[PDB]
Structure formats: structure tokens, C-alpha cells
Structure 1
Amino acid sequence: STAIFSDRYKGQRVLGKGSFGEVILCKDKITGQECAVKVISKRQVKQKTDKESLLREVQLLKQLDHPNIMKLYEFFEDKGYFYLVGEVYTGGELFDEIISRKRFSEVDAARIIRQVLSGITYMHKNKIVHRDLKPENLLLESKSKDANIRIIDFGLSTHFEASKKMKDKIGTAYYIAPEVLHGTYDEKCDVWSTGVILYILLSGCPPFNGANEYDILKKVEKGKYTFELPQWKKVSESAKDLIRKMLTYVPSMRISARDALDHEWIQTYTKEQISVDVPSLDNAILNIRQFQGTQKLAQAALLYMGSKLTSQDETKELTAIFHKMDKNGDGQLDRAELIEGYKELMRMKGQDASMLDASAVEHEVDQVLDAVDFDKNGYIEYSEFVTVAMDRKTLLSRERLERAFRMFDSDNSGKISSTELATIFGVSDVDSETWKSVLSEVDKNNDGEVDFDEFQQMLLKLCGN
């Protein structure tokens, strides 16, 4: 009597994309309980462990409870997917919220890091290491101002091989502990990462930085950072001392999460009354707004490139599936076949995680047919169904590209400088000669700035079109 995910949950909408897979907002078909389901495709992510080991982990994680740790409820596995069912949080990533404040101080930073250390300490007590700890993994419980922080993805790194695809590792290099690179690591790597996050919260820049991923890893691996920037003048010795102890090279000498919790800086700046000297850190908030925008734009760039490539793969495949089922040779089909075909795209592709059952397909087809000026129930021309169907998929990633572009263009200039692109393509790890070569060909008269149409053409060229 084996339990199947879609007998129990129905997908409502897509919340976003995390490490290892898609996150879908799901709903229990009997109780109406809402849940965020991480869908990990077995074809894209290799396991590092055996079946036994992972189930034992899942059982343990379901029994753990802490106010700063995402709550896991259920776990399903079928032939091509793992489904991790957790509590849904609606407050978004930490940094996205933080850029929307107009004021931020050492009291606010300290309240954040106390939360984080407190979830970590708890998990280390139960011998669970995060390993991939970074700002994207800190969500706020709700859209409330006073919202708690929940750490997501504890436990996954020990059982799943991380993606090599750069679309999946944007922004990991800044946070990873030297010893994780060399392969002998323990729980202290989580303190390093938190130490980095605190450095960024107090200055707005990463302690280890570089023009591309491998440059960033080389700094980290050397382990040298400095407090020499102007904005460190605004910050207590005490906080710098904690940072130093968290960013200590040799893990055996690095402070534990639990001893970090008792550190003077945390004690002083997390007492709710005393604000003995609490300047706003506007430079920090300004640098963080820039650093965040850069990342989210590179991220959306690569997901747009990926979506375009996925699209070409799926358009040609869907066309061939239909061309085959069309025994007539005319180009005409009906609703129930379009559905059988779309489904068979899914059986082969298995890329779309909001199509978690036969009923998700039915409704997608109806959304397509209701879009085209076509009776959803006479005989339809497959050619035009394929066009509308695929674009509808490129919507999410094309509209988000435009939006991450607008959000990056903070002065509403309409354009990004050649210097800004350099930073954008550095972070997306697209070779410099290669993007200059593409720019040169889009606008052959340009003067080191591109508008949105131009930028988008560059991306289409960088994925072979």
C-alpha cells in the first residue's frame, strides 16, 4: 500500500526555484493545509548516499523543532522525483527584505545573526551540518516587520550532489568555507558562512570577492580579508572581533556556533532596551542593494538562457510527438490527444514540476486553448497550439529578466554601462572575450551601454541563437 504524493497534494502555484529543485505551493486534498514542496529531479541531481541513509535523515528532520529552522512534514519518492514537503513561508529572502528598509544598524544585524546562530547551534547538537549556508537560505516567516528567520535546506547537502551548472551555483563561492573545498569539513563550516554573512550585513561587500567564480574561490582558499574599507569605521571593535573568530582559518580554532551566541557583541547589541550608540549603516545598505541587484540580474540572465534552450528542446519534441499522432497528415488534432501528447512530452522531458499529475496537464491544455481563438473542443491545428504552449513557459523567465533588469537600473537610465555588464557576466561566469564579441555584433556602433532590447539580444546570442 505505497503512498503517492499526488494522491494527497495538488499543486497550486510555483513559489520559486531553490537549490536542488523547484518549490511548488501545494495543498492537501482533504485537510486544505498549505505546504511548500521541494521537487528534486533524479535525472538532474545525483544522490551521494544510499536509500537507507537518506530516509534515516528524513525521519530525524521531521522530529526536530526550532523557531529558526524550516519545519519538514513529509517525504515522497517516486521513479523520477523526491518530494520534500515543508511549512510554507511568505516573507521572502532576508536580503530582499533588508534592501527595502531605509534604515539598518548593528542592532538589526545582531538580531538576525542571533537567530541564525540559534538555529545552527540547535542543528549541530543533533549532528546536522548545513554546508551550503548563504543569504538565499534565510527566509522570513511572514511579510511582518518583526518576522522570524527560518533556515531552509538543512540536510540536503549531505545527500545530494550540488549542481555544477552555473545557473544553480550563482552566489555560492562567497560563502563556502575553505575546508569544504579541500574536502575535510565538520560543523564549523557553518560558522564560517555565518561569519561571511555578518561581514556583508555590516559592510555590504563580500569579504572574499573577484571577477568570477574561480577568482573568488582563490581568495577564500587563501583566507585573507581586511576591515580596511571606509564603512568599517562605523562598526564596533566587538563585532569585528566576532567576525575574526568566525572567519578563522583552521576550524579547530574557530569559534563554535554556541560560543558565538555568548559573544559580547551578540550580548550587547541584542538587548532590547539599550541602544547605547546605534547609527544607521546607510553605506552598508547601499552596497547591499547593489550587490543584491547584480546577483539577481545574473541569476535571471542565466535562467533566461536556460529557458530559451529548454524551449527549443521542447518545441521540436512536442511538434514531433504530434506530427506522429496525426495519422491524417493534415496538421489537425483534438483536446484529448493534445493532452496525451503533452503528457508524453512530460514522460520524456520530466522538466515541469507544476505538472505533478494528469489533472495538471488537462488544465494547462485548457489554458492554452482558451488563449488561442479556438473552440476548446472541435479540432485544432497542432502547429499553433505548440507556439502558444511554449511561450507560456518562457513568460515567467522573460518577464523576470525584464524585472530584474528594471530593478538593477536603479536610476531609471534605461541602460547598463559596459562596466556594469562586466560585473554581471563575471558573476554568471561568461568569458569576457565571449560577451564583448557578442555585444560588438548586436550594436556595432555602440558606446559601452545597452538597453533592455540589446541586453536581451546578447543573451539570445550567448545561447546559440
Structure 2
Amino acid sequence: DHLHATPGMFVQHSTAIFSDRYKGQRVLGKGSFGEVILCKDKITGQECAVKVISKDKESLLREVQLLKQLDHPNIMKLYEFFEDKGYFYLVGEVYTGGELFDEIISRKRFSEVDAARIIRQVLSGITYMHKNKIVHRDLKPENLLLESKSKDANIRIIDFGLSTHFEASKKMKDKIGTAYYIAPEVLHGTYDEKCDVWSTGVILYILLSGCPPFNGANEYDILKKVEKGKYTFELPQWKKVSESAKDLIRKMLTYVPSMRISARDALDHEWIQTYTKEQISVDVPSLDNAILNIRQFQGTQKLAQAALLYMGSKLTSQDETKELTAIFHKMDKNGDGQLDRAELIEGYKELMRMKGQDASMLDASAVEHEVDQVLDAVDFDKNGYIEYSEFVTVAMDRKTLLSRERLERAFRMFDSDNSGKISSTELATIFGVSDVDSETWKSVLSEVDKNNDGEVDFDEFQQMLLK
């Protein structure tokens, strides 16, 4: 019955029709014409990518349920999922840099420093997925999108159509994937999440050499080579490549699954952790402001909590969140895309150092105490970590977040029956729960309900957040 807010809970919540929220602009990307479309949010102006499917049914809902559970800077963001009598609409964050595949086929080779940045990002994404008991099963350059045409463009893992939850008690069986990238043990039909590490190793091999490690004339020929598992670093193709990169590839293409490196350990591999010593630059004012915002969140009621998370997780662009994203990655010491307690502690210590404060001025456990309070307050879903959307929601300048349009969008999202007022039932529904506690609704009303009708109109909704 608990009210734990996640970005995922908003995805299928809209009572509205697709065409009443979005205006179609052009086709987007290089696929079959008209299947993916660039659209503008009619209220906010926000551009998005809409996958339109004419109506297969069951598996698309599985995909949506998985994407809803995932909130990571290297995983595609899903905004909304609509269903008509004739169409499904998957509305997502737009990534304008095209597939990694297309960068590969347009150049001989990636430099080690360039391949490492890309692979770090993939490994950050799948370390997070695996920790959440989700395996991708179709990692390949086609399913990695670049966020923009910029040369520093972040990588997004997409196309979770073949993805599933996995358990330690039973093995996966489905002989599923794509020939160049599929782990030998998938072919044999008993496997675990290490199948994703193999696929990622193949991507890495291709990035550094320009060729697949298991090749052939057709799908059957490719699969026999994969089954056999034998690969080589042919000279002179590989002559200039460092031993350390080869070491990583050797670990990720390790044939026996139990001896293959995990995604977390690959993320922690020396080649990944040492490829650069460049530090992300964050100015004192911005970090200080972020921490300020973060620590002041304690005590917020549930309607405001859900409203803010909707706005931060669904209605903010990358351009709008640039500084906060940089702060997030700076604080994310192990680079797994989550902030844990230890990392938050170091974030506080870092700020103190930057501001020229004396740390010993505080008692030994002063920082730990602060972080324990911040954690309870900012960890929306109570999973013990601060995820990217939780962080941005709370760390962003509140006046910036609460634009007129975001406010309208948020209100209409909660006001399911379009009555002009938000009810306790409408709050219960958005949280995906059967009933909201009588106590929880009361704590909302005592702060927000200015005219004592037991519901929240647009005027009170604005005041709740703005004042």
C-alpha cells in the first residue's frame, strides 16, 4: 500500500488520446518509413520520438513494463505509452545522433580512448540492468543510439524487445539474439546475464578493429564460429592496440560463462577506469546550489512529491539539465549510474573542500547524519539509491522546473477525469496503488486545500509548488 514514487508509474497513466497531447512533425531515423516519428508535446513544446505500431500485443507490454523499471543515464527514456483501437504509440526521449552502427560503418576504426568512453557507458547501463535483474539479450551497435550529433554524445541503450527479468534459481533458455553478438551459451540454450557481457565484448572488438570477431558468409556460418568460440587479434590489424584493451576483450569473450567477467567487474577494469584522468568540471556555485536544493527536500507531502518527479523525470530535456547531469556523474564515483550513501558522503566532502571549509570543524559523523536525512527524503522509491531522475528532480532550481507549461502538463496528468480538481483516488491511481491512506490525503489537504472541498484545483496545485 506504500506510496513510493518512480518515473515508471507515469508512463501508462494518461486518460487522454495521443493526438490530444502530441503533434507529429517529421519521420525520424533511418528505418522503415513512418514507424518512428518526431513529435512536439502540444503543451510543453518538448520534442519526442514516437514509435507507432498498427495492431505482438503481449510482448510490447512486457517491453514497456521493463523500461518503466529502468532509470539510467545510458538507458532510453520512455515518456508515455498509448493504445488506440488500431495503434500503439511509444513516446520516448529523442536521440538525434543515429545508431552507433552508422558511426562504425563510416570510419576505419575507433581509437582506444574513443572506444573506452562508449563501452564505459554501455557497461554502466548493463551493470545497472543486471543489478535490477534485467538482461537485455540484444546488445549491438544498432541498439545503441547517440544522444546528439555532437562528438561528445552520450550513448543510449534502446530496443528492449528481447529483454527479460532473470533469476539465480532458474536459468534462461530462449535461443535469442543477433548472430555477430550472441553468446555461445545462448545457442546451447542454457545461460545467464553474462550473455550481455559477451555481446558487449563483441561490440568492443568491432570498435577497435572495424571487423566482427566471428564472421562468415551467412547466419548459419556465423553461428558455427560463435559456437566454437575461437577468435584472434590478427596482425597487423591489431598491432597498435594496447595489451590492456586486449585483456578486457579476452575477459568479456571468455567462453566459459562462469569464468567470464561480470559487467560490474568490466566497468571496474583498469582499461575502463584509467583511459582518462580528465575530471568533470563543476563550479562551486552549481554544486552548492544542488546540495542546497537536495537537503531542503525533507518533509514534502505525496502529491507534491509525485508532481515534482513527473516534471523532472518526464518533462525536462538534456539541454535544460546539463549542469545537473555533470554533477551527477562527478558524484557517481563507481560510474554505475546510481548515487549510493558513500558517494553522497564524498559529494558533501567535495563541496566543503571546494568552498574552502574546515571539515574537522564538524564532528566525525556529521556528514553521515546529513546524508542519512537527505537519503530518506530524496530517495523517492525507497530503493536505497538516488537514481538520475530522483537527483535531477530535487537538485534542479525549483523556479526553473516549475514553468507554466510543466505545471499545466503535471496538473492535467493527475486530473484524470478532467474535473478541474485532483482527488485522493486520482492520487492513489497515479501511484499505482488501490487506496491512499486517510492520513496521507489529510497531510496534503492541510497544506494545500485553501477552500476546504477536499480536492486540489489548478490554483491550489500551483500554490503548493510555487510557495
5+ residue gaps in structure 1?
A: 42-49
Distance 1:153 1:251, change over 3 A: same
Question: SS in structure 1 opposite 2:451?
Answer: coil
Q: CA deviation at 1:130?
A: 1.1
Distance 1:105 1:295, change over 3 A: farther
Distance 1:227 1:303, change over 3 A: farther
Distance 1:144 1:253, change over 3 A: same
Distance 1:264 1:450, change over 3 A: farther
5+ residue gaps in structure 2?
A: 1-13
Q: Is the 8 A contact 2:134 2:163 kept in 1?
A: no
Q: CA deviation at 1:242?
A: 1.2
Q: Between the two proteins, what is the percent identity of the paired residues? A: 100
Q: Is the 8 A contact 1:15 1:23 kept in 2?
A: yes
Alignment deviations for residues 118-147 of structure 1 (CA, whole Å, 9 cap, x no partner): 111111111221111100111111111111
Distance 1:279 1:98, change over 3 A: farther
How far apart are the structure 2 equivalents of 1:454 and 1:188? 51
Question: SS in structure 1 opposite 2:306?
Answer: helix
How far apart are the structure 1 equivalents of 2:276 and 2:164? 33
Distance 1:451 1:7, change over 3 A: closer
Task: Verify: 1:62 aligned to 2:68, yes or no.
Answer: yes
**Which stretch has the larger CA shift, 76-85 or 387-396?**
387-396
How far apart are the structure 1 equivalents of 2:331 and 2:241? 68
Distance 1:108 1:11, change over 3 A: same
Alignment deviations for residues 406-427 of structure 1 (CA, whole Å, 9 cap, x no partner): 9999999999999999999999
**Which stretch has the larger CA shift, 316-325 or 242-251?**
316-325
Q: CA deviation at 1:101?
A: 6.7
Question: SS in structure 2 opposite 1:457?
Answer: helix
How far apart are the structure 1 equivalents of 2:205 and 2:295? 15
Distance 1:271 1:169, change over 3 A: farther
Alignment deviations for residues 198-253 of structure 1 (CA, whole Å, 9 cap, x no partner): 11111111100001111111111111111133121211222112111111222222
How far apart are the structure 2 equivalents of 1:216 and 1:432? 61
Distance 1:373 1:283, change over 3 A: closer
Distance 1:363 1:15, change over 3 A: farther
Task: Verify: 1:3 aligned to 2:9, yes or no.
Answer: no
RMSD value over aligned CA atoms?
A: 25.4
Q: Is the 8 A contact 2:309 2:389 kept in 1?
A: no
Task: Verify: 1:34 aligned to 2:47, yes or no.
Answer: yes
**Which stretch has the larger CA shift, 11-20 or 85-94?**
11-20
Distance 1:401 1:199, change over 3 A: farther
- Indicate the residue corresponding to 2:178 in structure 1: 172
Q: Is the 8 A contact 1:166 1:428 kept in 2?
A: no
**Which stretch has the larger CA shift, 211-220 or 177-186?**
177-186
**Which stretch has the larger CA shift, 152-161 or 225-234?**
152-161
Q: Is the 8 A contact 2:204 2:249 kept in 1?
A: yes
**Which stretch has the larger CA shift, 398-407 or 219-228?**
398-407
Equivalent pairs counted in the alignment come to: 453
Q: Is the 8 A contact 1:14 1:354 kept in 2?
A: no
Task: Verify: 1:247 aligned to 2:253, yes or no.
Answer: yes
**Which stretch has the larger CA shift, 12-21 or 261-270?**
12-21
Question: SS in structure 1 opposite 2:79?
Answer: strand
How far apart are the structure 1 equivalents of 2:457 and 2:197? 41
How far apart are the structure 2 equivalents of 1:227 and 1:293? 58
Distance 1:271 1:365, change over 3 A: closer
- Indicate the residue corresponding to 1:96 in structure 2: 102
TM-score, structure 2 normalization: 0.50
Distance 1:109 1:397, change over 3 A: farther
**Which stretch has the larger CA shift, 267-276 or 83-92?**
267-276
How far apart are the structure 2 equivalents of 1:57 and 1:111? 27
Alignment deviations for residues 136-188 of structure 1 (CA, whole Å, 9 cap, x no partner): 11111111111111111235544999999999999931111222223333211
How far apart are the structure 2 equivalents of 1:35 and 1:175? 30
**Which stretch has the larger CA shift, 285-294 or 162-171?**
285-294
Q: Is the 8 A contact 1:304 1:397 kept in 2?
A: no
**Which stretch has the larger CA shift, 364-373 or 280-289?**
364-373
- Indicate the residue corresponding to 2:409 in structure 1: 403
**Which stretch has the larger CA shift, 114-123 or 168-177?**
168-177
How far apart are the structure 1 equivalents of 2:241 and 2:261? 20
How far apart are the structure 1 equivalents of 2:42 and 2:83? 19
How far apart are the structure 2 equivalents of 1:222 and 1:231? 22
